[model samples]
Target: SMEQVAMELRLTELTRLLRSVLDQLQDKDPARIFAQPVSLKEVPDYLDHIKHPMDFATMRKRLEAQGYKNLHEFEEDFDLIIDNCMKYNARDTVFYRAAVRLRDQGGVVLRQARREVDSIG
Candidate 1:
């Protein structure tokens, strides 16, 4: 029981930081298109082109499930969301542009999270 409880204790602060990281990205996504998983219907070739797909909802799910072992782990998967979009769409397209927009702020959010985690430690 102590070990089990330790899991949440270890995870809790990162939870707050992770939540803030996500919502800040949410702020970046004004169209909310990035908020949910990209549907196959939306882009019929999406799954075919992108082998690993991720998004805000899935990240939230993984965060809630405590699927990540650490903040960097989440960041890797978190960044996966953008990589998929840019990979599937051409550089000139809307999805690629949207993915690029998140590209700027996404790394900053992680830096903020790291700084907060370290200083607050």
Candidate 2:
């Protein structure tokens, strides 16, 4: 159980960094981030390698509690993750690759945003 918590924390932190980068690009306007089209499809098969300790339902509930209304918000959040990887020219790492998938799947990265927001408040 400790390992699960640790893994989830690590994942939470890792996703936080990736999500932060995306957040920084928004210039404080949440709506502007989703002006482009978003593809809310499945995450890549390689994401199985990243090992997320949290279940999807739990993460979704947290996001909902944080006032996540629709997939647009989720889409915007993930689109930023993909944008972050490209902006930094560092898409070679496992995190980067996984971020690509996370952006598409639309769960982990959005949950990270809620955690980041909660910590700030």
Candidate 3:
């Protein structure tokens, strides 16, 4: 019972995080950016597709198909993803989806930062 309750709580938190990510992404203009459409309910399954030992290269390839170019570029967002993944159970779909959204957000932030630096020179 305790385990079930804990799982439900984690799932609930994951779902809330996913919803917030979706809302933020939807509010932004996707033009000039890559858009990925994935079911937030299938995040754990997607993560399962991740190879063992969690190396960035492998993960980057998978994310690349979803339009991500660099992993370090989204470190903060991925940290949240890893946090929510905890034990990598099937219920982490929401967290995974939220991760994707955060990754995209991070990309936007990075591009802006680069642009700002370039303009200064």
Candidate 4:
């Protein structure tokens, strides 16, 4: 029973860490591109290029469903969203450039989140 409480606390912390990072990106994302899934009509070949597309909105919903068990999973999704951008958009495109900036900044945020949670142990 007590161990369950500790486990729940840890999950809460992990979720919080991921949520905070999601909020940061939503606030600063260029044109809110990462806010939700790209419409298939908007990019007919999106799936053809990016086998798996990810977005912050989907990650938030996943957090709602207890989809993530640890920080690395969250990081993977974060990277996936950005990688899909690079896959679907050329390096010179605005979408790809924005993803590049987000990728750089996201690395910092995730690193900080990992430290914050790890320090709690």
- Candidate achieving the largest lDDT: 4
Whichever of 1 and 3 has more lDDT, that candidate is 1
- Summing lDDT over every window of 10 consecutive residues in candidate 1, give the lowest-scoring window: 63-72
Q: Which candidate has the highest TM-score of all?
A: 4
TM-score of each candidate structure, all chains considered together: 0.87, 0.28, 0.28, 0.90
Q: Least accurate stretch of 10 residues (summed lDDT) in model 3?
A: 29-38
Off by over 4 Å in 1: 1-4
User: How does candidate 1 fare on TM-score?
Assistant: 0.87
Model 4: what TM-score? 0.90
Worst 10 residues of 4 by lDDT: 21-30
Candidate with the larger TM-score of 1 and 3:
1
Model 2: worst 10 consecutive residues (lDDT sum): 50-59
> Can you give the lDDT of residue 23 in candidate 2?
47
Q: How do the residues 1-121 of candidate 4 rate in per-residue lDDT, one tens digit apiece?
A: 9999999888887777777777876666858879889889978877887888899888999997778998889889988989899987898999999898888877777778889877875
Task: List residue ranges in candidate 3 displaced over 4 A.
Answer: 30-121
Residue pairs with colliding backbones in model 4 are: none
Clashing residue pairs found in predicted model 1 = none
Candidate 1 lDDT over 2-102, as tens digits, reads 99787778688678778778889878889876888888887887778888888899889988886776777887886788888778778999888988988
Writing each residue's lDDT as its tens digit, candidate 3 over 38-69 gives 33485546545544323233334544344332
lDDT of 4: 0.83
- Scored by Cα lDDT, where does model 2 land? 0.45
Candidate 4 regions with alpha-carbon error over 4 angstroms: none
